[PDB]
Amino acid sequence: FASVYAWNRKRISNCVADYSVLYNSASFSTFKCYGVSPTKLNDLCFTNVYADSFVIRGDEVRQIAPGQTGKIADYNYKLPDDFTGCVIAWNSNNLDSKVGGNYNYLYRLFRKSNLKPFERDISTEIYQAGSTPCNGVEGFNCYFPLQSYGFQPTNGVGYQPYRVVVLSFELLHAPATVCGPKKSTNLVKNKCVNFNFNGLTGTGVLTESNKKFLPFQQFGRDIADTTDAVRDPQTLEILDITPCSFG
Amino acid sequence: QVQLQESGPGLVKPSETLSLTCTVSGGSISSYYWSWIRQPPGKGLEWIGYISYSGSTNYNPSLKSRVTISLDTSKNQFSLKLSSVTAADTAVYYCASNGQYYDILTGQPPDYWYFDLWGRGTLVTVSSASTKGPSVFPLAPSSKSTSGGTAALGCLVKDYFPEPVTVSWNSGALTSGVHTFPAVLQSSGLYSLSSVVTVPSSSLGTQTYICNVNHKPSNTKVDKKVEPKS
Amino acid sequence: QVQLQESGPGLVKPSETLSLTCTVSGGSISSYYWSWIRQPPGKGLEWIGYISYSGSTNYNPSLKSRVTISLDTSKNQFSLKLSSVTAADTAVYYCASNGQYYDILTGQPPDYWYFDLWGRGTLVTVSSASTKGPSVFPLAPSSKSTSGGTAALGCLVKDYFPEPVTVSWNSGALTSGVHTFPAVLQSSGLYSLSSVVTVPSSSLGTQTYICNVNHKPSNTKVDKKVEPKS
Amino acid sequence: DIVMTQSPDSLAVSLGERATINCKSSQSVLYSSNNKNYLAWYQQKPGQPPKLLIYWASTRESGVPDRFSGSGSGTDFTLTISSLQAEDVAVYYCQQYYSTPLTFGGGTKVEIKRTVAAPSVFIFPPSDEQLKSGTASVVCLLNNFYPREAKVQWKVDNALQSGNSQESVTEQDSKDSTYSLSSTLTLSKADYEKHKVYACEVTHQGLSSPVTKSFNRGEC
Amino acid sequence: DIVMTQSPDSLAVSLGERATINCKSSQSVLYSSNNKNYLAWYQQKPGQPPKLLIYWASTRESGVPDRFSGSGSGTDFTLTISSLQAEDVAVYYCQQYYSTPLTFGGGTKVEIKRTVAAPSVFIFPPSDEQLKSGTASVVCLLNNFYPREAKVQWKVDNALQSGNSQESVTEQDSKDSTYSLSSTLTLSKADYEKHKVYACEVTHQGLSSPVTKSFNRGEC
Ligand SMILES: *[C@@H]1O[C@H](CO)[C@@H](O[C@@H]2O[C@H](CO)[C@@H](O)[C@H](O)[C@H]2NC(C)=O)[C@H](O)[C@H]1NC(C)=O
C-alpha cells in the first residue's frame, strides 16, 4: 500500500463498475457510504471515480469521515464537508506488521495549518514549535515533522495496521462516464412478451427475420415511424417486432 | 536488548567506494537513531552521522558529500557509503545507537543520542597493495628462554598485508601466559607479529602447544606445534 | 455525573415480594440502560436485567418470571420486583448504569453496557425471624490489654437480627486503631460483633471514648462510654 | 451462555513484584468487524460498590492511576499492575458484554505479605450489665498481625474450652497490611460464676512461645 | 562547532589513590529550561568497543560498578573513581550532545605502577623452515615488567646492531600490571650465515646489571 502522509490517487475512468462485489464481500471491517447508500451504486452513473489508498492505525479509521479532527484528518488526509463517495477499510495485521516492527509507514504530525480537502503535502522541512531559527537541523523546540508507526504483530487491536480505500465519485459537467452494471436476460421469440433491447422498450411478438441491416444499424422503422425490427445485441440477428395482437 | 554487527570489504583500493552494513539482530527494537562512528588506530573517536526511522539523515560537516547513510526496513539493515576513499580513512568503524523508548510528546530530539548499544567494529585501510598470507615459524622453548620454574615458547607469524590476523594457542585452550604482541609494519609494507606463552619448564614437550593461525581476509588456517630445540 | 441510591424493605418474610427503587439524582442524565446487579455475601457478582428508556426490558435467564423492572419517568425512578423470594436471595443489590452519550446512528446497542455509574448497595435476606435490637456492653481498657505505650478498649454489640448495624467511636472522631470486626451469627440465630480501638496507655480515661451504636432497620441509637476497670 | 474463568484465585504478591490474572472465554469476542473486543475490569474493595478500571480490553479512563494496565485480546485476557501498592488488596472481576447475558468473573484475592508482626493480645471480662441479663461474653482481642494463621485457645481454670467460642477477622489493613482478630467466649451467668481464672492463649509465628492474657473473675 | 578539551592525558595513579579528569566545553550546556546537562562518559579497553558509564552528567546505570562516579555541571566536568582497581587501565572519553555535531574528547591514559619487576628474557633463533625461504628472524622476548623503559641491544659477534630490529609492547596487564616486549632482528640467510654468536642484551631498572641471552648459530 501507500503511506498515510503521501496517499495514492488512482483515477478510475470509463468502464463497468460493480460495487456489489465490494459491498457483499464481507471481508471489509468498515464500509460507510455518505453521499449515497451502498445498494444504489450499481444503478447510477458519474463522470469520474477517484480511489485513494493508504494505511493507518486501527482506531484512526474514525477520522476518515467528513467533519473530523485529529492528527490524521488535520494534516494527513482531509475529506470535504459534502463528501459523496464511500470509505472502505479492512484489517491487515499479517501483511504489514512484521516481527520487530515495520517502521515503513510514516505519518505527518507537525504542520502549520490544517489541510484543505483533498490536499497533499510531501515536504520534509524541519518544524520549529519554538521561537528560534533552526537552519535545518533537529534540536529543542523545532523537530522533524514525520513519525513512524512501529507496527508489531503482538499489538492489541486498535494498534494493528488497517488498510483504507476512499472512493470519491465526482460529477463535473461532461457528457457521461462509468456507471453500474447491466445484466442480460434471454429472448423468447414468438409470443407477445414485453421487451427491452438495450434501451428500446416495447411490447409484441418477436419473430425470426429475413431482412439484412447494415452492420452498424440497430433497429428498423416503418413509414409512419414505428419500430418494427431489432437486432439482438448478443447474437446479432434481426427479429421483426410485429405489434401485439388486437382487434 | 539487541546486538549489532558489521560487514565491510576488508581492504579497499584508493579512490574507490566503501561498503559497510550493520544488521540489527535481537529482541524488540526500541531505537530511533542509527549512527556510525569512526576511530583511527590509536587516535580519537569521531562521529560520522546518523539516520532515523523517519528517514531524517544528518551528517558531520567534515565528511559531507562523501557519506550517504541508507536504511532498509525489510532486512533490518542500514548501511554507509564512503565514496572516493583516501589514505586518511584508515580506521575501525562502529555502528552504535540508543536503546531508549521514544516519545516526542515528552522529550526533545537531542535526548536520544548518547550511544548506548555498540557494535563490534571492523578494521579498514584505503590500501591497495593487494593481499597476501602469513608465513609461520615456531619459536621453540629453550634454556636461553628457560629460567627456573618456567620456560617460554611461541609462534612467529610474519609477512602479511591483511591487518586483521589471529593466532590462538591450542584452539583457545591456554589463556595463561599467552600474549600476542602488536603487529609490526616493515619497510616491505607487510605486517609481522609473534605471540608467546610461558609454561612450566617441567612441561617443555609434555603437553600440547599448537598455535592456530587464522587469516580472515584470506582463508588461511594452519596449526603449528612448538617443541624444544633439537 | 449523577449518583444513584436505593431503598429496599430491609428484611423480607419468605415467599413474599421484594421492593427496591433506585432514584437517579444528579445533573444532566445521559444514560439509556438502567441495570440491577446482584451479589451474595462473599460470592460472585450476577447481573439481573436492565430496562431502557424505550421500555425495552431484558432479563437474565436464571431469574426469568420472577423479575419485573419498571420505569417511572415522572420521578426519575425505576424499580425491581422479585416476587416469591427464597432463602437463596440473600444478597446486596446494586443499581448501575453507563454514563455515555447515546447514538444508534453511530453505534450498536451492546456498546453501552459496561456499568460505569454505580449505586451504593442495600443488604437483604429472605429471612422472617422478625426483628430485634442490639444489646451493648463496654469492654474496658485493662492492663491485660495494655502493653507499653498503648492500651485497647471497645464496645460489644450483640444479639440482633437486622444485619446492617453500625458502631462509631466518638461520633466519628477517632479513625486511628478503630476496627470493627465482622459480625458473627450464633446458633440462636442472632448476630453479634465487637469493635475495638487502641489508644495510648497514658490516655486510659483521659479523653472521650464513646461508642455510638446505630441500628438502621430499627431506630436504636445509644452512646456508651468505655472506662478502665474499677 | 458465555462464561469467563478466572484461574489465579489467590495472589500473595508483595510490594514491587509482578501481579497477573487470567480470564479466558467460552466463545469469541472482538466482533468480526472493525475493532474493539468487549471486556471490562472492576476493582472491589470490601464494603464498597465496585469501580471500573478498563473500558474495552486495555484502555482506561480518568480516575484510575496509570499503574493499572490491561493487556490481551481475542479470547485470552490479562490485567497488569505496577508492582502493587499500599491499598490494592481487593477482589477483581472481568465482566464481558457480547449480547444479552452479561456475565462476570469468579473473583481474585490480590494479597501481599508482611514479615513477623506479632499480635497485641487483650482479654476483656464480661461487663456487670451483662451478668444482670444472665449471660457472660468473654472477649479476647488480637491486634495487628501478618500471619493470620493464629490460634486462640480459651482456658477456664486451665481446662481447654471447645465449642463455645466464635472468631472473626478483619480484612488485611490497607496501611500496614496486618490482620486483627476477635474471639468471643459465651457462657451463662450460672456457669460463669462456677470458675475463677479465664485465660486466652494466643499462638503465632511472631511469638517464640504462646502468650496468655488472663483475669480472675471478681477481682477489681 | 563545539569541542571538549580533556586536559590530564596521562595518569600514573596507583592503587588506593585519587583519579581525576577534566573536560571543559566551548559553549554552554544544561539547556536553559528544566534541568539535565548533556554529557556522557565512555570507558574503552584495548580491542573492545567502548562501553558507557554515565547518562547525563553524573548518573550511571546498571552494569557499571558504583565506584565510577560523575561530578561537575555547567561547563566544567569531572569523573571520579574508587581509588582505581585491578582492571581500570583504559582510555576515557567525554562525548557531548547538544545539537547535531556530536563531538568526543581527546583521550586519557589512566595507568598505575608496580615496583621493581625485572623481565624474564628469552632469545629464539630462526626456525629451519625460514632459512630455506632465505631470511632469518631472531626474536628476543622480555616477559612481564613494570618499567617499560627497557632497552634491547642486539649484538652480532659482539657488534651492536643498529637499524635492523623492530619492537612492540603489550598493553599494561589487567592482572599484574606488567608489560611484555618482543624485539625482532631481521637478516638475510646469506648475512645470517656470516656470523656466529647472536645475543640480546636487556637493560632494566629491576636488573642490577644487564642480562644477555645468546645462542651460537648452528649448535644443537
Ligand atoms: C458476447 O460474448 C459471446 C460469447 O460469450 C460472443 O459470442 C459468440 O458468437 C460467435 C459467432 O461469431 C459464435 O461462433 C460463438 O460460439 C459465440 N460464443 C458463445 C459463447 O456463444 C458474442 O459475440 C459477444 N458479443 C459481441 C457483441 O461480440
Numbering used by the authors:
A (entry chain A): 347 to 593
B (entry chain H), C (entry chain J): 1 to 230
D (entry chain N), E (entry chain K): 1 to 220
What's the publication's text?
RBD, which directly binds to ACE2 receptor, is a major target for development of the therapeutic nAbs against COVID-19. The prefusion structure of S protein exhibits more dynamic conformational changes in S1 region, especially in RBD, which has two distinctive conformations, “up” and “down”.10,11 Only the “up” conformation of RBD can bind to the ACE2 receptor. To further explore the interactions between nAbs and S proteins, we solved cryo-electron microscopy (cryo-EM) structures of the S protein in complex with ten nAbs, in full-length IgG-form or in both IgG-form and Fab-form. Bivalent binding was revealed for the full-length form nAbs, which showed that the full-length form exhibits different binding mode and induces more RBDs to the “up” conformation than the Fab-form that is monovalent.
P5A-1B9, the most potent neutralizing nAb as shown by the neutralization experiments against both live and pseudotyped virus in this work, constitutes the pattern 4 that contains one “up” RBD and two “down” RBDs. The inter-molecular angle between P5A-1B9 and RBD is 52° anti-clockwise. Upon binding, P5A-1B9 approaches RBD from a direction different from those of the group 1 and 2 antibodies. Among these nAbs, the group 3 nAb P5A-1B9 has the highest inhibitory activities against the cell infection of both pseudotyped and live SARS-CoV-2. Structure of the complex of P5A-1B9 with the S protein shows that it can bind to RBD in both “up” and “down” conformation, similar to the nAb BD-368-2 reported by another study, suggesting a common mechanism behind these nAbs of very high potency. The neutralizing activity measured by IC50 showed that the IgG-form was about 450- and 900-fold higher than that of Fab-form for P5A-1B8 (0.08 nM for IgG, 36.25 nM for Fab) and P5A-1B9 (0.01 nM for IgG, 9.12 nM for Fab). IgG-form of P5A-2G7 showed mild shedding ability while Fab-form nearly lost the shedding ability. Both IgG- and Fab-form of P5A-1B9 showed similar mild shedding ability probably due to the long distances between Fab of P5A-1B9 in the complex with the S protein, which do not allow bivalent binding to two RBDs from one spike, suggesting the bivalent binding might contribute to the shedding capability. The most potent nAb P5A-1B9 only has mild shedding ability, whereas P5A-3A1 with relative weak neutralization ability possesses high shedding ability, suggesting the shedding ability contributed partially to the total neutralization ability.
